[PDB]
């Protein structure tokens, strides 16, 4: 029970379960391109001049309409993944809350629904500070400093 | 160099309005198609009133608008435009300056083209005395329509040309002898709030339309005011409370009638501040509610709202934005112009820039 | 015009002499390679910075 | 402010309950703002910590 | 007492006006300019194999 | 609205030192309250010394109440001899675009309405002081609209506690608090009356039917999770439902021809829903960027196009 | 509640004002050493700070 | 508490006066007993400060 | 000032005629911009969430988006001008009714999501829901009717306007489409009328036409219940709905050189507040 | 009584007793009761000589 399995994860007991921890990481790479002698027909038109006033200032937003025709029977370009720069995502251990989420039915006894929420969100790395808005998007407590 | 404005045209019968007697530059007011009027009065009225009074008062008006020239009462084209000088002289028995009020009625019952004009005013003001009783309020029905610049005349219909947005002094009249106009208003309605609050400071000012009601058992009044003020639209509700608060005192005590209160006082105190104190009180969970074997042990509570003076029956005023005067000092005059052989107390508002707005009840 | 005659380009060249100093090319540019405890800091009680 | 965790090891608040928090035994000995060891000439190394 | 303040020299830049046909990327294009494109629906290029 | 715009000219006096003249050129887009729509005013009219009542400098709560009697304007440009603003209530410019500058601790988003708030935050009440003229220019803080419905609701609820915590907020996850201070008894009662008028006026006889739907909701939050996370953990109606079993009245006087549920909802919209305009001021302004971003940052300008 | 916490009345002194707190009581229960080790281990615990 | 009356019904005066006190919130020092030392460092409790 | 909504490539032949039939209709976009893609315009552009949005979330996006009225439709790009910045320069832009209700001169016009009863482009895989431009005094009636319909579930469908009859029922989806409105309108009132009932516990107990008026005339002169923490749960909730159910009118029709009453399928000229 | 900012006496049956015996009949005192915020007003004099 989610009340009962609250106790046996805090007290170090192993219940009859396992898990597959899945996460996603994003890296920064440097790539190498090769294309060919005529890989793209590129038709460009004639420029336009616009005029719109903003905040006292007067913008002249200039445009030029263009065209991409890819005259290749088959492939004409290759990305070559060469090196790996700094990985962006830190490879920590951030557990996922579902108290951020909304759409699951509660337990009935409303003297006990407050008990779990003030014992999982209470001191959590991700859980909602303000209670979850009925139609907004719940917010994550902003850390004082990233490392 | 002409500033940007917006003209309107609408084929309008000259039943209630006359762009011939009222010259270039009076107010106007659009109306709803009157087939909606007493069906809403059958529906929205407080309990225990005569809902068919609106259908009979408005009935007797249209029926007195012709009496002759064989003319049908329903029509495809229908007059939904009431001129402003027609409306002030309708409610002209409910002002303070009555000697100037009959000087508005003196050209209303004379300068209008028609036979037995004043038989409408004893009826149309009674129609407004039925709008309040049958509780469909006229600010839910009236609506601003612009001020005149021209008119094209035919028997009983005319081409009304008005300014729905912009400055009044910008639209061409039609005669190049006098190619503009000015907003022309009778002095029985134009009541400032500058000297009447002490605000003698110069500055730009707003113009508002303001209605007044008085809900009693067949003792019901009506007024129209065009108020110049340096006040915000958000900040009018205290200032209208200062003037018309006596009508608010009457409406909250003599507006609620024929409702039957529950006799005697039945509803007790609300004990939730005391019921939440004891942990020994019986309770219920989310599945046990809406069950007959559990709800009988809860607290029974039967609220009886009957005869409460609701907010919709304590209205004393309703306003709307009408336009501003952007000048450094607002320049008003006070003259008397000659509508034929009747001379009128006339307020000439000058340099008016039109912005209509929504209505707002001061309940 | 944007690109005028820049102010410093109006001068003349100075006079030049011949100075013995080591030259190394690293990358694609000439660089003086110069150790400075023989001309300066020779037998003077000042710490080498 | 220990409502949040350590930025470096993100899964715990600190590594010392006696040296990290405010008005702690870690603070009372080594702050110039408290001045317990301002008198001695011996440089305490964690003064910049 | 005699004093100064000084404004010695005013330094600017020169923008690098790169032409696209001065680049080694310009092989992969076939750039023939339109005096109009906005007057055109879906146009086509035919291929035979 | 006029065609050629309408720009008032707040006058700068003669004797102003260079430590003060460069202190007004950082006032490029702020919110400045004109009392009238005169084309020519003075800084002695703008500053907080003209804001005071008879000698009682009011609290933050009265500082809400004397904005709705003034006309908020935004500076467009600062000359050496006069400051030019544009009143929000009349007309913006030719363009309808007047650049602001965020004083907020909270960044903006596109399209969001701006209602302005006094400087309630801690470590934040930064008043540009003129020393050679002895003036304080309190610049109010533009905030997004659902913040201004919180902070006004926090302060009015706080003053009721004195008539016998709360001051913690959260928005976009950045924890921020507000200044705790004693509140004068005067303007707080002007708020309590403006509540209970708009609170009682939303009670029609039709609300005796809606108050018998409370046993349906407390059972509906058992099954659909939308109604669970609607009520709240810290609400009234949950503990109200656990003790009260309401039941409807028997009949209505002439209840056939009239709709009791319909009249309770029309009166609810114009009175209790309207309440966010009575306590605070009106959200005149939203942010309509042309090219820039979804988010306008703190300390940055923002183009602005008007709004109901 | 009688089974987890002790039921000492403060007419005989409570926890924080006694001289042997709670964490000696639980150290009796959560040790895995035997009977010949706790007799020295408790004596090892009553050395004052 | 000061020792009131004889020692006989000293505990009956406790449990008849303190029944409502033990059921407000949980006891602090017993809840610090089932704490793993790598949980105690985390901000999961409100007793770090 | 006219923006461009470019149509992406691959348009079928009935679909070039389908977009030929929305000539003068109201469309919402995120940000005023001279170039914009049609995929940011469609109903898909705010299905964000995991359920496609119902009539409540439609209203919220309509105050965060900037309404534009489509001018001419070129087969490559949809040319439009927005109703907030583009109408101070150009004066008046035509507008087509999708309403079952005709327009009169001088009415102000709000917009309602299509609650009554929808161009689909299967070459592009999107729907285009469009608002219903009805006049704003009906807007505080019709939405107040449809909210009042769902309260019966836990006589009404009679409406007259301009000498006509309206039938809102015309049953299956629309009651289920309007579940989220019904479950907030009730909650705000039941939270309101119990806090008000808690602050002054006598407001239901005084004699109505005899003693309660004195309780009204005085108001006009110038464990623990977590009550004072629950005003904020009411005031911010009620202060949010006061914008959404306001339905503020962008649009007022000033008829000039035309018919007085504009019927369904016809065009009516439109100005903003100047 | 024009002014505001002094504590009135506690018996509200007697605080009004002076005001209806001083301002009532005055050359200066206000006609309307005082507005709660800003500035009381002098009555309108019909003649100045």
PDB file of N, CA and C in Angstrom, chain I residues 138-180:
ATOM      1  N   UNK I 138     -25.225  39.231 -25.313  1.00  0.00           N
ATOM      2  CA  UNK I 138     -25.636  37.834 -25.294  1.00  0.00           C
ATOM      3  C   UNK I 138     -24.592  36.960 -24.626  1.00  0.00           C
ATOM      4  N   UNK I 139     -23.336  37.414 -24.612  1.00  0.00           N
ATOM      5  CA  UNK I 139     -22.239  36.602 -24.103  1.00  0.00           C
ATOM      6  C   UNK I 139     -22.350  36.367 -22.608  1.00  0.00           C
ATOM      7  N   UNK I 140     -22.810  37.362 -21.862  1.00  0.00           N
ATOM      8  CA  UNK I 140     -23.081  37.157 -20.451  1.00  0.00           C
ATOM      9  C   UNK I 140     -24.422  36.484 -20.211  1.00  0.00           C
ATOM     10  N   UNK I 141     -25.196  36.237 -21.262  1.00  0.00           N
ATOM     11  CA  UNK I 141     -26.377  35.399 -21.160  1.00  0.00           C
ATOM     12  C   UNK I 141     -26.081  33.958 -21.537  1.00  0.00           C
ATOM     13  N   UNK I 142     -25.517  33.741 -22.731  1.00  0.00           N
ATOM     14  CA  UNK I 142     -25.433  32.408 -23.326  1.00  0.00           C
ATOM     15  C   UNK I 142     -24.495  31.511 -22.528  1.00  0.00           C
ATOM     16  N   UNK I 143     -23.321  32.033 -22.163  1.00  0.00           N
ATOM     17  CA  UNK I 143     -22.400  31.279 -21.318  1.00  0.00           C
ATOM     18  C   UNK I 143     -23.005  31.056 -19.943  1.00  0.00           C
ATOM     19  N   UNK I 144     -23.736  32.041 -19.427  1.00  0.00           N
ATOM     20  CA  UNK I 144     -24.458  31.846 -18.182  1.00  0.00           C
ATOM     21  C   UNK I 144     -25.625  30.877 -18.328  1.00  0.00           C
ATOM     22  N   UNK I 145     -26.153  30.680 -19.539  1.00  0.00           N
ATOM     23  CA  UNK I 145     -27.127  29.611 -19.722  1.00  0.00           C
ATOM     24  C   UNK I 145     -26.451  28.253 -19.662  1.00  0.00           C
ATOM     25  N   UNK I 146     -25.351  28.101 -20.401  1.00  0.00           N
ATOM     26  CA  UNK I 146     -24.756  26.786 -20.589  1.00  0.00           C
ATOM     27  C   UNK I 146     -24.074  26.294 -19.322  1.00  0.00           C
ATOM     28  N   UNK I 147     -23.575  27.212 -18.496  1.00  0.00           N
ATOM     29  CA  UNK I 147     -23.140  26.843 -17.156  1.00  0.00           C
ATOM     30  C   UNK I 147     -24.332  26.411 -16.313  1.00  0.00           C
ATOM     31  N   UNK I 148     -25.455  27.119 -16.440  1.00  0.00           N
ATOM     32  CA  UNK I 148     -26.647  26.761 -15.684  1.00  0.00           C
ATOM     33  C   UNK I 148     -27.266  25.453 -16.154  1.00  0.00           C
ATOM     34  N   UNK I 149     -26.916  24.984 -17.350  1.00  0.00           N
ATOM     35  CA  UNK I 149     -27.439  23.711 -17.824  1.00  0.00           C
ATOM     36  C   UNK I 149     -26.864  22.548 -17.029  1.00  0.00           C
ATOM     37  N   UNK I 150     -25.542  22.534 -16.847  1.00  0.00           N
ATOM     38  CA  UNK I 150     -24.888  21.427 -16.172  1.00  0.00           C
ATOM     39  C   UNK I 150     -25.197  21.333 -14.697  1.00  0.00           C
ATOM     40  N   UNK I 151     -25.631  22.436 -14.088  1.00  0.00           N
ATOM     41  CA  UNK I 151     -26.023  22.410 -12.688  1.00  0.00           C
ATOM     42  C   UNK I 151     -27.332  21.650 -12.501  1.00  0.00           C
ATOM     43  N   UNK I 152     -28.178  21.602 -13.534  1.00  0.00           N
ATOM     44  CA  UNK I 152     -29.386  20.786 -13.473  1.00  0.00           C
ATOM     45  C   UNK I 152     -29.067  19.300 -13.422  1.00  0.00           C
ATOM     46  N   UNK I 153     -27.940  18.890 -14.011  1.00  0.00           N
ATOM     47  CA  UNK I 153     -27.612  17.477 -14.131  1.00  0.00           C
ATOM     48  C   UNK I 153     -27.254  16.834 -12.801  1.00  0.00           C
ATOM     49  N   UNK I 154     -26.809  17.615 -11.828  1.00  0.00           N
ATOM     50  CA  UNK I 154     -26.325  17.049 -10.581  1.00  0.00           C
ATOM     51  C   UNK I 154     -27.374  17.153  -9.480  1.00  0.00           C
ATOM     52  N   UNK I 155     -37.559  24.900 -20.817  1.00  0.00           N
ATOM     53  CA  UNK I 155     -37.567  26.008 -19.873  1.00  0.00           C
ATOM     54  C   UNK I 155     -36.289  26.829 -20.029  1.00  0.00           C
ATOM     55  N   UNK I 156     -35.142  26.177 -19.892  1.00  0.00           N
ATOM     56  CA  UNK I 156     -33.874  26.889 -19.910  1.00  0.00           C
ATOM     57  C   UNK I 156     -33.447  27.312 -21.309  1.00  0.00           C
ATOM     58  N   UNK I 157     -33.783  26.537 -22.340  1.00  0.00           N
ATOM     59  CA  UNK I 157     -33.232  26.726 -23.676  1.00  0.00           C
ATOM     60  C   UNK I 157     -34.037  27.700 -24.519  1.00  0.00           C
ATOM     61  N   UNK I 158     -34.724  28.645 -23.892  1.00  0.00           N
ATOM     62  CA  UNK I 158     -35.484  29.659 -24.603  1.00  0.00           C
ATOM     63  C   UNK I 158     -34.636  30.923 -24.669  1.00  0.00           C
ATOM     64  N   UNK I 159     -34.431  31.439 -25.878  1.00  0.00           N
ATOM     65  CA  UNK I 159     -33.706  32.687 -26.082  1.00  0.00           C
ATOM     66  C   UNK I 159     -34.298  33.445 -27.250  1.00  0.00           C
ATOM     67  N   UNK I 160     -34.544  34.734 -27.047  1.00  0.00           N
ATOM     68  CA  UNK I 160     -35.025  35.616 -28.095  1.00  0.00           C
ATOM     69  C   UNK I 160     -34.013  36.730 -28.304  1.00  0.00           C
ATOM     70  N   UNK I 161     -33.794  37.073 -29.568  1.00  0.00           N
ATOM     71  CA  UNK I 161     -32.957  38.204 -29.941  1.00  0.00           C
ATOM     72  C   UNK I 161     -33.399  38.664 -31.317  1.00  0.00           C
ATOM     73  N   UNK I 162     -33.607  39.979 -31.459  1.00  0.00           N
ATOM     74  CA  UNK I 162     -33.908  40.647 -32.729  1.00  0.00           C
ATOM     75  C   UNK I 162     -35.144  40.043 -33.393  1.00  0.00           C
ATOM     76  N   UNK I 163     -36.178  39.817 -32.591  1.00  0.00           N
ATOM     77  CA  UNK I 163     -37.415  39.271 -33.107  1.00  0.00           C
ATOM     78  C   UNK I 163     -37.334  37.842 -33.577  1.00  0.00           C
ATOM     79  N   UNK I 164     -36.331  37.091 -33.136  1.00  0.00           N
ATOM     80  CA  UNK I 164     -36.126  35.727 -33.596  1.00  0.00           C
ATOM     81  C   UNK I 164     -36.192  34.783 -32.408  1.00  0.00           C
ATOM     82  N   UNK I 165     -35.990  33.505 -32.688  1.00  0.00           N
ATOM     83  CA  UNK I 165     -35.949  32.480 -31.665  1.00  0.00           C
ATOM     84  C   UNK I 165     -34.608  31.771 -31.748  1.00  0.00           C
ATOM     85  N   UNK I 166     -34.037  31.453 -30.595  1.00  0.00           N
ATOM     86  CA  UNK I 166     -32.818  30.668 -30.526  1.00  0.00           C
ATOM     87  C   UNK I 166     -33.087  29.399 -29.738  1.00  0.00           C
ATOM     88  N   UNK I 167     -32.549  28.290 -30.228  1.00  0.00           N
ATOM     89  CA  UNK I 167     -32.593  27.010 -29.535  1.00  0.00           C
ATOM     90  C   UNK I 167     -31.153  26.559 -29.339  1.00  0.00           C
ATOM     91  N   UNK I 168     -30.702  26.543 -28.089  1.00  0.00           N
ATOM     92  CA  UNK I 168     -29.332  26.145 -27.807  1.00  0.00           C
ATOM     93  C   UNK I 168     -29.126  24.648 -27.967  1.00  0.00           C
ATOM     94  N   UNK I 169     -30.168  23.856 -27.723  1.00  0.00           N
ATOM     95  CA  UNK I 169     -30.060  22.408 -27.812  1.00  0.00           C
ATOM     96  C   UNK I 169     -29.903  21.922 -29.248  1.00  0.00           C
ATOM     97  N   UNK I 170     -30.445  22.670 -30.211  1.00  0.00           N
ATOM     98  CA  UNK I 170     -30.390  22.392 -31.653  1.00  0.00           C
ATOM     99  C   UNK I 170     -30.917  21.009 -32.017  1.00  0.00           C
ATOM    100  N   UNK I 171     -26.277  17.531 -27.633  1.00  0.00           N
ATOM    101  CA  UNK I 171     -26.629  17.035 -26.307  1.00  0.00           C
ATOM    102  C   UNK I 171     -25.536  16.137 -25.758  1.00  0.00           C
ATOM    103  N   UNK I 172     -25.007  15.287 -26.629  1.00  0.00           N
ATOM    104  CA  UNK I 172     -23.993  14.329 -26.257  1.00  0.00           C
ATOM    105  C   UNK I 172     -22.671  14.937 -25.832  1.00  0.00           C
ATOM    106  N   UNK I 173     -21.921  15.521 -26.774  1.00  0.00           N
ATOM    107  CA  UNK I 173     -20.570  15.982 -26.432  1.00  0.00           C
ATOM    108  C   UNK I 173     -20.524  17.279 -25.639  1.00  0.00           C
ATOM    109  N   UNK I 174     -21.467  18.195 -25.886  1.00  0.00           N
ATOM    110  CA  UNK I 174     -21.341  19.575 -25.415  1.00  0.00           C
ATOM    111  C   UNK I 174     -21.464  19.650 -23.898  1.00  0.00           C
ATOM    112  N   UNK I 175     -22.326  18.819 -23.312  1.00  0.00           N
ATOM    113  CA  UNK I 175     -22.376  18.708 -21.858  1.00  0.00           C
ATOM    114  C   UNK I 175     -21.075  18.136 -21.304  1.00  0.00           C
ATOM    115  N   UNK I 176     -20.495  17.149 -21.981  1.00  0.00           N
ATOM    116  CA  UNK I 176     -19.189  16.638 -21.594  1.00  0.00           C
ATOM    117  C   UNK I 176     -18.053  17.575 -21.977  1.00  0.00           C
ATOM    118  N   UNK I 177     -18.255  18.411 -22.995  1.00  0.00           N
ATOM    119  CA  UNK I 177     -17.270  19.416 -23.375  1.00  0.00           C
ATOM    120  C   UNK I 177     -17.210  20.552 -22.364  1.00  0.00           C
ATOM    121  N   UNK I 178     -18.262  20.733 -21.580  1.00  0.00           N
ATOM    122  CA  UNK I 178     -18.379  21.831 -20.633  1.00  0.00           C
ATOM    123  C   UNK I 178     -18.484  21.268 -19.217  1.00  0.00           C
ATOM    124  N   UNK I 179     -17.602  20.329 -18.901  1.00  0.00           N
ATOM    125  CA  UNK I 179     -17.533  19.822 -17.539  1.00  0.00           C
ATOM    126  C   UNK I 179     -16.651  20.671 -16.640  1.00  0.00           C
ATOM    127  N   UNK I 180     -15.565  21.224 -17.177  1.00  0.00           N
ATOM    128  CA  UNK I 180     -14.607  21.944 -16.343  1.00  0.00           C
ATOM    129  C   UNK I 180     -15.136  23.303 -15.911  1.00  0.00           C
TER     130      UNK I 180
END
